[PDB]
Design a protein around this ligand. Structure first.
Ligand SMILES: NC(=O)c1ccc[n+]([C@@H]2O[C@H](COP(=O)([O-])OP(=O)(O)OC[C@H]3O[C@@H](n4cnc5c(N)ncnc54)[C@H](O)[C@@H]3O)[C@@H](O)[C@H]2O)c1
Ligand SMILES: NC(=O)c1ccc[n+]([C@@H]2O[C@H](COP(=O)([O-])OP(=O)(O)OC[C@H]3O[C@@H](n4cnc5c(N)ncnc54)[C@H](O)[C@@H]3O)[C@@H](O)[C@H]2O)c1
Lengths: 299, 300
């Protein structure tokens, strides 16, 4: 028995039922209502609106698995789940293309300053000289993290003629070569790159992966994209690089603190940003419905 | 041997001219008055967009034989007045194509994810997630009108995103277009299929208002439109009315029937993103156009 408590694609319920599970769909429930529905349930599927708090988890006696049809666990008390022996699942594949597409958009925006040009036009200005940009053809793109999103960015930007190099400690040079990315050690990467984009998880080993030492090994006027997680690019180092001109531009979808209380990066003229929109598409939201229902049916 | 450069060009342009054995004067920004005086002893003028080579100027410039534009088209040159006085006109139809294609693709992505709007919101100190829901390009259909230099480069880039690419061009066979992945159909069958449409034609009487009230009404509700070609191909009044009703969900404009535009309604619309005619505005394209036009002059 599974409860679906948020508004999901009807393609989730079907698969569950084909797997041999009983389903109940229903949203916008109160705490009390939610706990009552769960009384006979070993499975719950949410997206963002349903708040799977310690209080709900502790009152739901038969529950063994909670699925979120998104990335992260923002609306789930992961710790209370673990005290109770409940497994928490996510959908590591459903968001990949939306995030890769944003990344590529960010790259193009940094080459040509579209978002600053738009702001200028809307202020009534006509600023030709100011927004002289860069042609991507023949430029080198460094891709750090060559998993699901990394390789999708690579084949897209190869169609603009960009040379794609990268680094990933787990993906073989043979696998990367099949999507046209030549692997090298980090220290050989930095000096080659006109653009660098990051697609790694956030771990102790990736916290400040770009920092003051790595920025000094980059080409003068490098442009940087972070559509992964806040913290992979050290934010103080990035502002220093933007102040000196070592970094000519940055695009940020994510921040160490969200919303970010320090505004100096966001306010810089050469920085473009979004409020963590990498998974913010109808299509990504729906693939996630399928992805999580299918894991539950395998379970 | 004397040639004036009257607009701001890549410094490779004069260099080469000088290597050819010509004297050069770079004096961008000049009144009708100042320009005619500079030309008095010149047989060559190279412009970009700001200098207006009018019938007036041409008729006062006694010793001129050749005018070069470091761009496409001849928008700031009176070609009928040059030809009457027997003057040949030069332009650079190749140097800019990839920069224009790249901007076009940037514009498509910006419209799908509202990147310029989201940046403005962030810089206004807000965190507005809910509000910036977007569209994934994969599996969407892109209409491409004009399948020459730029149209075909746009096609191959956007095919890498999984967009289905359809289009129309009166000169390119359906066999040729199919070899770069574009399926040619009559215009009337294109309009209803498209999630995005982008134009890449010259401005001609047949392309003036190629999108208009009648064609917008045959489009899918919520179509998104890009004009990185010339102002006027998309009828501006028809566009604003399509944005107002929701028939068009979004537009991106790099060019205007008047530049800079005095009517601000399109530019001010929340679902419109725009630039000040930046399609050729990259160091590399300006360097190539500079070279392209100087080389023609040295050959003369
Ligand atoms: N912006 C958004 O809203 C959004 C949406 C989806 C995913 N993401 C994020 O984007 C990132 C990438 O996701 P993915 O699905 O491609 O992940 P993945 O797990 O498929 O691949 C990640 C890769 O990162 C590599 N990596 C780890 N440490 C590294 C290092 N030190 N140097 C180089 N590479 C290293 C791993 O070897 C792995 O191959 C994640 O942080 C994810 O949370 C963000
Ligand atoms: N900065 C900028 O924004 C920028 C820069 C360069 C060029 N441009 C413009 O973009 C446009 C295309 O440039 P190009 O080099 O790609 O031109 P091109 O000559 O290589 O191609 C133009 C194509 O449009 C086609 N065409 C003609 N009539 C048509 C119709 N009625 N419907 C559909 N297609 C039609 C022609 O058959 C031709 O193949 C031009 O208007 C050019 O001036 C803009």
């Amino acid at each position: 028995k599974v409860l679906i408590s948020d508004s999901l694609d009807p393609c989730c319920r079907k698969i569950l039922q084909d797997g041999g599970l009983q389903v109940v769909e229903k949203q916008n429930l109160s705490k009390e209502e939610l706990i009552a529905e769960l009384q006979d349930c070993e499975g719950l599927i949410v997206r963002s609106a349903t708040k799977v708090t310690a209080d709900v988890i502790n009152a739901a006696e038969k529950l063994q698995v909670v699925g979120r049809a998104g990335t992260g666990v923002d609306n789930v008390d992961l710790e209370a789940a673990t005290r109770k022996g409940i497994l928490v699942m996510n959908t590591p594949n459903g968001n990949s293309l939306s995030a890769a597409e944003l990344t590529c958009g960010m790259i193009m925006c940094l080459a040509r300053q579209i978002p600053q040009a738009t702001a200028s036009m809307k202020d009534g200005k006509w600023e030709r000289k100011k927004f002289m940009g860069t042609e991507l053809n023949g430029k080198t793109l460094g891709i750090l993290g060559l998993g699901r999103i990394g390789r999708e960015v690579a084949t897209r930007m190869q169609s603009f003629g960009m040379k794609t190099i990268g680094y990933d400690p787990i993906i073989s040079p043979e696998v990367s070569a099949s999507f046209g990315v030549q692997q090298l050690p980090l220290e050989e990467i930095w000096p080659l790159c006109d653009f660098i984009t990051v697609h790694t998880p956030l771990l102790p080993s990736t916290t400040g992966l770009l920092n003051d030492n790595t920025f000094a090994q980059c080409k003068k006027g490098v442009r940087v994209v972070n559509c992964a997680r806040g913290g992979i690019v050290d934010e103080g180092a990035l502002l220093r690089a933007l102040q000196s001109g070592q970094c000519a531009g940055a695009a940020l979808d994510v921040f160490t603190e969200e919303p970010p209380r320090d505004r100096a990066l966001v306010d810089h003229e050469n920085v473009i940003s979004c409020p963590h929109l990498g998974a913010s598409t109808k299509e990504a939201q729906s693939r996630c419905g399928e992805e999580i229902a299918v894991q539950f049916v395998d379970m």
